């Protein structure tokens, strides 16, 4: 019969830059071995966050350039915001 099933892969990228500050941005090459049949959907979020109250909390995360073979794990803060340590989590299913 015809049915719906999803293949999923997931992981966590961790960043501990303290005492140093974590970079404005960061991009990681995440690959799916083996590739998917079609380009899956991916969502990213935070599992651990270390933000200084001396400035507004501005943390953005995302999956950019999603290829059936992998995707770019993207993170960035902006303006005067300062991030000390942070863990990203992502899950891509199809």
């Amino acid at each position: 019969r015809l049915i719906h099933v999803s293949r999923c892969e997931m992981g966590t990228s961790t960043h501990r830059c303290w005492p140093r500050p974590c970079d404005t941005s960061s991009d990681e090459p995440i690959s799916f071995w083996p590739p998917f049949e079609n380009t899956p959907n991916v969502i990213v979020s935070f599992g651990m966050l270390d933000v200084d109250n001396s400035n507004n909390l501005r943390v953005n995360s995302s999956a950019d350039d999603v290829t059936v073979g992998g995707f770019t794990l993207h993170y960035n803060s902006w303006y005067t915001t300062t991030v000390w340590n942070y863990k990203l989590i992502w899950i891509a299913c199809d």
Copy 2:
């Protein structure tokens, strides 16, 4: 034989309000196509968060009124808090 397998859907919903503050609360109808054969589960979180340090960080997000047809992507803040931008993420499996 019998096996376990899930069908998962997933999406994001970006709310950029700056220079205006984001609505205190938000509810968006999300539709599943095609409908699940049985009610699915749904977890919601944040992929991007921009909140003013002028006050405590009070952000809530959920999936209310879930069914086989879909759910309501609910988000809200409370008290004297202020959010300039935020991205909600969700995933629903069965």
Copy 3:
């Protein structure tokens, strides 16, 4: 034919503490019913969060001792940070 498919179990854990500050750390055992063929993968994030601006934001979370029958839903803050309410969300797939 040989294919890839998954089984995803997921959920949420709400911790309301205000007016009492939430515990520095909190562990919660989760059970997979029935058990997975093999050891799944879990990722935990936040779905709600209430953090005091009087200090930096320091929230961490993870899935510990993940077995075919369950994992431990871990939460913790550190140092001077304070938390009033929060919701954890996790999802596992094989």
Copy 4:
């Protein structure tokens, strides 16, 4: 994603009659259990056969009144044929 996967059920049914000839036709209700989700196809054939050369070889078999919960395994012969033994084999997938 969408995939095509089938569930199959299959069985044999031996009929030994000799020294007596097997009855002109024979019907036997088969039960799928648990029931099927869709109404499946079924094909019947012969795994063993013992027929008399004294006449032509006239044998017929078929799945009948197929539900999502079973069907009638049917066998028969017409006219002057004489069958001494036979085993029906059947397979039903979806």
Copy 5:
């Protein structure tokens, strides 16, 4: 996770020729909608048979030119044989 599942298709082709005798051979086009990811395996047999004892029983059948799109349901006899009526059954799975 990696599992083995199969997709199967099946069907029958009834040939009632009496009083006329059945053609020596028959090749029928069977197609698959939609086609397989990869080329299936196919097997054929007889569901009903009507062979004249005046001569030896000789029946052959097979799936020819099998591809992801379908195949050719071939049937034939040879030499002195005579077949009055007959049905073929086939099932393909990948």
Copy 6:
């Protein structure tokens, strides 16, 4: 979700003895690579049959010694029957 899926395997062994008559019995060992998770169901039938009319048609076939790793492809005739050529077909799903 819980669903039903079968994994199948199939094949056909041919035997061309004319003018030599085919042995009374034959047993071919079949392997299942990779080995089913749990013991499968097998069914065998005739894809090509060539029998001399000078005696009753007595043919039999089956799958014996069925294990998750394989099975034995059994075939025989008995008493006065004489078989010149024949082909067996088998399909085993779990």
